[PDB]
Amino acid sequence: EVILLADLVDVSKPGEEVEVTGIYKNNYDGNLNAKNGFPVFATIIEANSIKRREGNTANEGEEGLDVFSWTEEEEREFRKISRDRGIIDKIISSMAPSIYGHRDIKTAVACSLFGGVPKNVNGKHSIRGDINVLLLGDPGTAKSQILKYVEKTAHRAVFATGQGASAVGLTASVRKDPITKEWTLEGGALVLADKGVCLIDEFDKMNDQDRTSIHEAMEQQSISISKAGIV
Amino acid sequence: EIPELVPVGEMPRNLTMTCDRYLTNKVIPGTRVTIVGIYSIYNSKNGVAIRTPYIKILGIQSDVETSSIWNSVTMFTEEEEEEFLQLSRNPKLYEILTNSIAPSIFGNEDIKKAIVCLLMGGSKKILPDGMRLRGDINVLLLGDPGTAKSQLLKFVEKVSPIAVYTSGKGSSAAGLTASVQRDPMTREFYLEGGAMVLADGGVVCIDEFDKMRDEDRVAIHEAMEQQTISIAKAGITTVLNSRT
Amino acid sequence: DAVFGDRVRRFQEFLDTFTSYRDSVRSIQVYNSNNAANYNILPHRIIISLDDLREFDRSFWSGILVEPAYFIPPAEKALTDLADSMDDVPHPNASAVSSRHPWKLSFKGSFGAHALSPRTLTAQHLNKLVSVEGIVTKTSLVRPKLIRSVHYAAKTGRFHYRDYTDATTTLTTRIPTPAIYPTEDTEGNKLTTEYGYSTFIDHQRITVQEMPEMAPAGQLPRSIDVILDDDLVDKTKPGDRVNVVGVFKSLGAGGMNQSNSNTLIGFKTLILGNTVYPLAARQMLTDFDIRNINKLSKKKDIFDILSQSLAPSIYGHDHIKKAILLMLMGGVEKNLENGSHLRGDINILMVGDPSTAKSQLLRFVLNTASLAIATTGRGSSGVGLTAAVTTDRETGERRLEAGAMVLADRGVVCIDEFDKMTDVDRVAIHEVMEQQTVTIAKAGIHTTLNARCSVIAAANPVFGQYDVNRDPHQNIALPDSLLSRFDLLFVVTDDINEIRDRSISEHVLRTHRYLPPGYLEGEPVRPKLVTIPFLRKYVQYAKERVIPQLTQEAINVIVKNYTDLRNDPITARTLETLIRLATAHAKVRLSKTVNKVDAKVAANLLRFALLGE
Amino acid sequence: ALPSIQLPVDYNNLFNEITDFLVTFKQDTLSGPKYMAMLQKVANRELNSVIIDLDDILQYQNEKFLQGTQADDLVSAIQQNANHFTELFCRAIDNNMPLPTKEIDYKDDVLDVILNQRRLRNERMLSDRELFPPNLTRRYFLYFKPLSQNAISSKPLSVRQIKGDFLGQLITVRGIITRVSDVKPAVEVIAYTCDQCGYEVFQEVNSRTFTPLSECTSEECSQNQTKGQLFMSTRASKFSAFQECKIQELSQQVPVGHIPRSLNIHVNGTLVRSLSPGDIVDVTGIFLPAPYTGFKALKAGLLTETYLEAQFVRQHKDVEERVMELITSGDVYNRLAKSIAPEIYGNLDVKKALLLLLVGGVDKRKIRGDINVCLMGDPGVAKSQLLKAICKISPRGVYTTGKLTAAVMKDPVTDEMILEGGALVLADNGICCIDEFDKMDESDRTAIHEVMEQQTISISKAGINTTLNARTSILAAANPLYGRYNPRLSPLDNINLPAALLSRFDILFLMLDIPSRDDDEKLAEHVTYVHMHNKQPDLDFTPVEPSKMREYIAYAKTKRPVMSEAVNDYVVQAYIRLRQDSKRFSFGQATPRTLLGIIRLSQALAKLRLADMVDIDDVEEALRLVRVSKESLYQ
Amino acid sequence: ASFTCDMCRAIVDNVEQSFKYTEPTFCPNPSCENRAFWTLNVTRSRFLDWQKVRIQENANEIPTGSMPRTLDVILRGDSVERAKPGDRCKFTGVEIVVPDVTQLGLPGVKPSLNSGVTGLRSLGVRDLTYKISFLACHVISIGNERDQEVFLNSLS
Ligand SMILES: Nc1ncnc2c1ncn2[C@@H]1O[C@H](COP(=O)(O)OP(=O)(O)O)[C@@H](O)[C@H]1O
Ligand SMILES: Nc1ncnc2c1ncn2[C@@H]1O[C@H](COP(=O)(O)OP(=O)(O)O)[C@@H](O)[C@H]1O
Ligand SMILES: Nc1ncnc2c1ncn2[C@@H]1O[C@H](COP(=O)(O)OP(=O)(O)O)[C@@H](O)[C@H]1O
Ligand SMILES: Nc1ncnc2c1ncn2[C@@H]1O[C@H](COP(=O)(O)OP(=O)(O)O)[C@@H](O)[C@H]1O
Ligand SMILES: [Zn+2]
Ligand SMILES: [Zn+2]
């Protein structure tokens, strides 16, 4: 059990992988000594900080709590490189540098990774802002390495493939808690990509019920749930 | 909390609140409400120093919700009633209501007329022999993608005073109709209403109706036609009214 | 007290003014004395009219209807004194002397604003006498409760009694007794408890839920818990549309203790039920109604009049409504000497096209029956139809609660969408159709439950529309074993027409043009035909009064028709089915014999049901 | 605090009436006081159960009325409060205890030696140079028997008709006992011994709970005020055989739309173990409440349970000369076939097979001796009526549905699961009638092989593995998946039964709903002829006698005949003939298991004719019945 | 364990807890008369690693139709995490017996089916139950470095 205090509340999410840097304390409880038979002390981690473990983080060069954060000099360099003519071609050619060719693939991935603008018209109409990209190709054309690069690159990135992705493994599900036996929602794969990228590998071989349960997230950008007394 | 204002990647958090005296029985579940009140702390029977928070309600306001629990009661103000009578005396209010539905959707004029007919609805009639006839109309938009059917569903959910928006994939037989749940403290079964109970007296909207399961489609037949859900489960038998 | 004695003499003056209550108390006492001491016992209760007490003393009427805790026990004391002064019995029993129940009050009359509903019972009506209406649910087990203990001391040889008070028993609040028997007397040394002279009353908790037709938009029905006094115990079964008159009272510390410093829980609220009214499932029969029934029974086409009197809004299905009429007045049941249970309850399965008004006939036989329970294909469970085992709150003991199919005993079950049960529910339903009793062997409980009930059910074919290809397998998706227990398999086809279609169209436009009486035009709703209460009185009269018996002039016709129908989906059970029609038509004629006109109508109806005529 | 009232019942005069009735009354209507003789038998240790009859008390007060004096209505005082009158009668018996007239056997009684040493203590301490509770010395258990044919105890009541006003009164209930617990000892006097003073103390128990004594309250132990620790002794304690069972309301007594209620019956003393589960009984007992102790009594308050302390239990339920009368009647096979289930017509051979199911076959020291029969017929030809009827003639048999099996269930009187017997358990040494053999569970589809083969119910649940006893003959009823029978449909394909089941199984009978005009008439006037008059019709034949079969089949089970060797040679030749027919559509061939079945049918008819040899014409008629089964396989 | 008195801040250290968490009774300051309310010193006290592994007999020595009997084995000190579940393994050490800790009157725990021993002052009127456990001191189980220098160092 990990204690979150002050700003650290609501930072972590259910299913989110984190690196907690915290003080490892111990306290006396009577239940462990009751059910164990030996003078055993419970252990409690008081968290001092939480770092999101985004991507593989095999690179140890990004030293900081948030890898996608910036300083003021980094913002100055962003404003410097944004005014260069041809920055679009630089971003496209720099997107997945380990893959040769495939200019349409890299352009579509850049468009999906940056995305458009969601629009609200008068509080009455909603326009989806994100861009969904399908890569149909022969095997041995490095379609999945681009997906792994987007996993490394995007701010939030969720992966799914094949029969291993259920209809409610995506979207969101409901479940009965062991305490009080109440029906509570559980966030799916698309809940963990609320401002990010969901990536599906081997899309055709996935079941139709599992393929196409994601219409409302990919069109209305929303998950409407009506089950077990929960709407 | 409001789904438009949820934080990124999280779940909407349920918060327990209380009303006293004449603030009680003012809201139907499913409405959108603005509430003013004090944020107090009460100790609960369920770690260290954890005292659960609540809000003691001092004031309830909701333009979408009217007349508290429904009694067919006229609480509209007199000058607004005169303005509404002026709208009913308009020679071309039909085109006004047609253009009011989906101003950002081109075409689909007959769909907009059917939507206005759905929102106004028919008249419920009672016969001396107990014959109850339907006073609502159910509209199914079947067609190609890119015809903005789901945008019409969302706008119907916005315009209607009592409305819920559901899925075909995200639905269930106990989810649309009323469900049988168990109370934790008493260990007794009780019926908690579903999506067609929260939409009683109003509009239920279903998206991707072609895809909802064959056991899931057919729990709706009495709720569409007979305007009731007859449930006999877990020792509880009842006929709830669902005028959706 | 002085004010207590003053209200005692005021209620004594009221009972002196109206001498009908004295006559009723005298009648109860002489009936008990004649049926108990000499060669089914009238209890200690009187029917107090609020209206008759209103013209006597409006202060006492307002005291009863506003603050009944200080007004009902003085009237109890005055009525007990009048019953003691009226009783003149020699040589009484010791248990009769020691254990006397005081004469309780049961209230009738108009209540005005106090006549309420379980949803609108609110905190301003606490400690007030209210009348509520709703469904009985979750009846607790009948369990005795001690209110007076009588002990004997042999060293002194004297009997000492101690009175025991509860929050639910007494309207006034007394200091609670911890229900410990006195081990020893202060002067009489050892004390021995003498059961039999001690006073025990039956205690029962019911739950009055709001009537679901009066539920508002978007809200579930609410419920209250009602204590039943020992006279009113077992008057109510679950599913009863009861009207309970009682004092809406709150009890308990309710979180005001020092342990519950900031818990926001409320107080536990109950109703101490003064009286219980059925609200007339078995309607009383005046002699004018009997004269009308026996006058119309002599007509030759009383079957036709009572058939088209059922649901005039529904056009067509005339033979189906005839079968519905013979279903409500189901045939006689015969129990043989060897123990074979021969079913007298005719059951009907209606399969066919959409919008042929099968579910509307289900709603009509729901409304017009004495006891009717509805169920749906996807809204039912097999355990939820027969019985479910659950704990009880006031006992801490496991017990059964009856499901849908058992609570409708001596009644009808209105099954809609029968073609799409889960197989688990199909097992239980088929078990009732072949056995009429359900055997529950679980939770340490080995019980059998009787269900002698009729079944009307509606179904669609396995296709979207019914085929005219007369395929036996595509009639229903259920197995033919469940088809066999249904006596009348009616099939309906919505064949597309012009003249009859125009007749149905004009009939339903005449149906929509009806305006209910006493209501304004254009506002929201808030050849002889007999009335439907008169039809229910006819059905009730035929059910309890006449038991027909079977006679040979129908029998030769029945065996000739069976040989014609079978030898030229037929079953031997069809023979019993003819009997389940034939004496049922005798229940139309009210005669105790069955004649040829019953058997010919039975053969015609079964030929319509099977061949289509 | 405790105010006092007056009641018009005198306990001293009633005690005088009881102690005069014990020495005065004698029953000369049957042809010295008989109750004094019973107390003499108590003093001679002949009997342990003393039954006071209220009819004897009513006749005694009627005799007092004949003498001219008047009693104090003793039987009404018994019926109002029997709990105090039980102890009053016990003290009246102890006041009039006769001297023993035989050998005492003083070495067996430890309490006599203890009370001898305590009287030595009392004479030594009070030399100066009650002692025991009365329930300790009581070796008799007192019971009450209600009056009959002479009044509330005489009238039998249902469980629902028992109200709160019937507490303290002797009542009578009719009901089926659901659960009977094991016989457990309940204490009445606890003996504690002091290790220092060497004395004892007795503490009486009249509740569900009791508290022990820590320190001795003896005069010698407290005079020097030594703090001796008391030790409980089970040797000198007074015990009673207590058993708690649950009685259920009969379904005829239950109103329409209600669930039957259960009541607790506690039996004590010599009335233990007479109660049996599944038995409809009349129980006359004292209706007493059961109070709690401590926190449960404080929280539940005035709301108190109840139980029944049973006083009397009544069961609701030459032979060879009648057997010889049935012999001289003639045609025992046809009479016992047509007499069984008189609501059906015809179908003689399958009805004879239903009889021979009840007859059964012989065993060998092991080969099973059970015959098993199936009705592999069309729907609507009265299957369940035959199953219910063949349950009603033969006792120790239950109707069951395959929608079946035995399993130990939880939520018992104890927290552990009790081995509640299923349908196969209670049908042991009898007949189990399984309806809808097509519609049955896969677990039962496993279980039927162990039922037929090893005749046991092997259940392993919650770490408990046990083998319950099911020595059961099986009737099966199996409709096919399609109702109609056609030669285009194979029999095994139509019935969809596995081949191993029919390989184990002996005799299938297929009757079909074939429309024949005269046959439908002869069935039709019979079916409506049970509907003409009251109950069973006239049989237009030798009439039925439902009581007569159950002893004749018991005698048939009693003979167990043994057959000769030349008849066995004819059986071998007939088996060779049926294997030659198996060389010759129904695939079903003759097996060695069918030969054992043929043998079972052979000694079944040897049992019916009460014969010592199996006759040759009996064997060929049995193989004719096998040919009838072959005709059923064809049609 | 080391504890401090809440009255006079006196220090009692080297309190040994056999099977339940125990506090000192007598304050070592003769001026102070404290008996209860002792505060634990988390930093000063010395702790050891604990692991409770549950074992059963192997399938070779299981007789016909028997559920396997179980035994709790305590690993302390260096021997923690040495034994992984599902392995044939040999523990050598001490057979010990453990009491019911709840029956000894542990602080903050209510007293909690076989009848055991009683008549103790810490028990009061309650009884004490015993379980067979094991205190193993050495474990064996009877059921990477991709560089040249460390591999030649690890080589014979
Ligand atoms: N420019 C490139 N074009 C095609 N394949 C490449 C390129 N660069 C690397 N690869 C190879 O593609 C492989 C990954 O292919 P993958 O995406 O798994 O195939 P698929 O598209 O069938 O899933 C890698 O092992 C890598 O060696
Ligand atoms: N007539 C239109 N006016 C404006 N937007 C439209 C129109 N037709 C289609 N669209 C756009 O195309 C999308 C169509 O989605 P929609 O057809 O509602 O999904 P579904 O196929 O699930 O019904 C919407 O997001 C909408 O913004
Ligand atoms: N006179 C009539 N003739 C035919 N149909 C009618 C008539 N009156 C009402 N109906 C229709 O019958 C319908 C009810 O049948 P339905 O609900 O389809 O039964 P089920 O639910 O069993 O299929 C109603 O919608 C009503 O419009
Ligand atoms: N003498 C008789 N001959 C044939 N059938 C009869 C006779 N008497 C009654 N029956 C009918 O047989 C039916 C029993 O059905 P049953 O054989 O149990 O059906 P299933 O074979 O589908 O289980 C009863 O409903 C009854 O109407
Ligand atoms: Zn002593
Ligand atoms: Zn100190």
Residue D415 maps to which CATH number? 3.40.50.300
Look at residue D635 and give its three-state secondary structure.
Answer: coil
CA E104 to chain centre: 16
**b vs e for C124-158, b when ≥16 Cβ sit within 10 Å of the residue's Cβ?**
eeeebbbbbbbbbbbbbebbbbbbbbbbbbeeeeb
**Hey, what's the torsion of the CAs at A101, A104, A109, A112, to 10 degrees?**
170
Question: Tokens 């079913």 belong to which residue?
Answer: C343
Check if B162 contacts C (Cβ < 8 Å): yes
D537 in contact with ligand 4, CB cutoff 6 A? no
Alpha carbon of D111 to ligand 5 centroid (Å): 19
CA D605 to chain centre: 31
* Interchain contact, B170 vs A191, CB within 8 Å: no
Q: Which secondary-structure segment (H or E) carries C107? A: strand C104-108
E27 and E86 assigned to the same domain: no
Q: How far is the CA of E2 from the centre of ligand 6 (A)?
A: 14
Identify whether residues E77 and E133 lie together within a single domain: yes
Q: E strands of B131-202, at which residues?
A: 132-133, 163-166, 179-182, 189-192
Binary contact (C381, B234; C-beta < 8 A):
yes
Query: Which of 196-225 (B) contact C at CB < 8 A?
Result: 197-202, 215, 218-219, 221-222, 225
With a CB cutoff of 8 Å and minimum separation 6, the contacts of D131 are D115, D118, D119, D122
Report how far apart the first and last C-alpha atoms of chain C are (Å, whole number).
Answer: 82
* Chain E residues within 8 angstroms (CB to CB) of chain A: 17-21, 40, 42, 47, 50, 52, 74, 98-99, 101-102, 106-109, 112, 131, 133
Q: Are residues E60 and E136 in the same domain?
A: yes
How many A from CA of D226 to the centre of ligand 5?
7
Q: E91 in helix, strand or coil?
A: strand
* Mutation choice for E interface testing from A28, A29, A33, A41 by most E CBs within 10 A: A33
**Element holding D459 (H helix, E strand):** strand D456-461
At A108 the three-state DSSP class reads: helix
Question: Is residue E111 assigned to a domain?
Answer: no
User: Which three-class secondary structure state does DSSP give residue C435?
Assistant: helix
Question: With helix as H, strand as E and coil as C, how does C206-256 read?
Answer: EEEEECHHHCCCCCCCCEEEEEECCCCCCCCCCCCEEEEEEEEEEECCCCC
Chain breaks in chain C (C to N over 2.5 A) after: 39, 279, 526, 568
Reported as type and span, the H/E element at residue D607 is helix D592-608
Residues 6 or more apart in contact with residue B83 via CB below 8 angstroms: none
- Please tell me the number of the ligand nearest to residue A96's CA: 1
Verify whether the Cβ–Cβ distance B170 to A156 is below 8 Å.
no
Residues C271/C132, Cβ–Cβ less than 8 Å: yes
Say if residues C372 and C366 touch (Cβ distance below 8 Å): yes
Residue type for position D457: I
Same domain, E88 and E23: no
Beta-carbon count within 10 A of C57 CB? 17
Which residues have C-beta within 8 Å of that of residue B26, sequence separation ≥ 6? B19, B60, B68
Quick check: B152 and A121 in contact, CB under 8 A?
no
Q: What is the CATH number of domain C1-114?
A: 3.30.1640.10
Q: How was this entry determined?
A: cryo-EM
Nearest Cα neighbor of D340 from D579, D332, D256 is D332
Mutate to test the pocket of ligand 4, among C576, C579, C580, C581 (most ligand atoms within 8 A of CB): C576
Is the CB of B235 less than 8 angstroms away from the CB of C213? no
Tokens of D38: 């019973």
Show residues of chain D in contact with C388, CB under 8 Å: none
Sign of CA dihedral C344, C350, C355, C356: negative
Are D249 and D255 a contacting pair, CB within 8 Å?
Answer: no
Data resolution in angstroms: 3.7
Q: Strand pairing partners for E54?
A: E72
Per the CB < 8 Å rule, is D5 touching C159?
Answer: yes
Residue corresponding to tokens 């007493």: D288
In a domain, E108, yes or no: no
**Residue in B198, B229, B237 closest to C373 by CB:** B237
DSSP-derived letter for residue A228 is T
Cβ–Cβ < 8 Å for B233, B182? no
Residues in chain B: 244
Q: Does E113 map to a domain?
A: no
Dihedral in degrees, nearest 10, Cα atoms C151, C153, C159, C164: -30
Q: Which residues of A touch B8 (CB under 8 A)?
A: 194-195
The token duo for C377 is 């294909």
SS3 D363: coil
- What's the rounded Cα separation, in Å, for the pair B228 and D184? 56
Cα–Cα distance measured from residue D283 to residue D266, given in angstroms and rounded to the nearest whole number? 11
Residues in chain C: 613
Both tokens of D328, joined, read: 């001289």
Which helix H or strand E contains C203, and what residues bound it? strand C199-210
CB A217 within 8 A of CB B207: no
CA A209 to chain centre: 23
Residue positions forming the annotated binding site of C for ATP: 352-359
What lies within 8 Å, CB to CB, of A210 at 6+ separation is A163, A165, A166, A167, A169, A170
Distance between CA atoms of residues D393 and D340, nearest Å: 8
Q: Which residues of B are annotated as a binding site for ATP?
A: 143-150
The CA distance from D278 to D245, in Å, is 11
CA D210 to chain centre: 34
Distance CA D187, CA D176 (A): 28
Q: Do B170 and A185 touch (CB under 8 A)?
A: no
Percent of chain B as helix, strand, coil, to the nearest 5: 25, 20, 55
- The C-alpha atoms of residue D358 and residue A159 are separated, in whole angstroms, by 70
What are the residues facing C198 on neighbouring strands?
A: none
Tell me how far apart the alpha carbons of residues E54 and E86 are, in angstroms, rounded to a whole number.
10
Q: Provide the token pair at C333.
A: 């049941």
H or E segment and range at residue C577: helix C573-589
Q: B90-125: string of b/e by CB count within 10 Å (b at 16+)?
A: eeeeeeebbebbbeebeebeebbebbbebbeeeeeb
- Sequence-distant contacts of E23-30: CB under 8 A, at least 24 apart: E29/E5
CA distances from D330 to A192, C153, C594, D617 (A): 89, 75, 41, 18
Kindly list the distances between the CA atom of residue C516 and the CA atoms of B134, C190, C536, D285, in Å, as whole numbers in the listed order: 16, 75, 22, 63
Query: Residue E26's domain spans which residues?
Result: 1-48
Same domain for E61 and E85? yes
Letter for the amino acid at D175? G
Comparing C-alpha atoms, which of D597, D588, D379 is closest to residue D492? Answer: D588
| Among candidate residues D360, D359, D363, D338, the one with its CA nearest the CA of residue D349 | D338
Domain holding D349, by residue range, is: 318-629
Q: List phi, psi (to 5°) of C442.
A: -165, 165
The residue contributing the CA closest to ligand 4 atom 14 is D382
Q: Is C402 buried (19+), middle (13-18) or exposed (0-12) by CB count in 10 A?
A: buried
Q: How far apart are CA D23 and CA D36, in angstroms?
A: 7
Distance from CA of B112 to the nearest CA of C (A): 25
Residue E74 lies in a domain: yes
Q: A110: part of which helix (H) or strand (E)?
A: helix A103-114
Torsion angles phi and psi, residue D142, rounded to 5 = -90, 135
Ligand 1, pocket residues at CB < 6 Å:
A 99-101, 139-145
Query: Considering its fold, how many domains does chain E have in total?
Result: 2
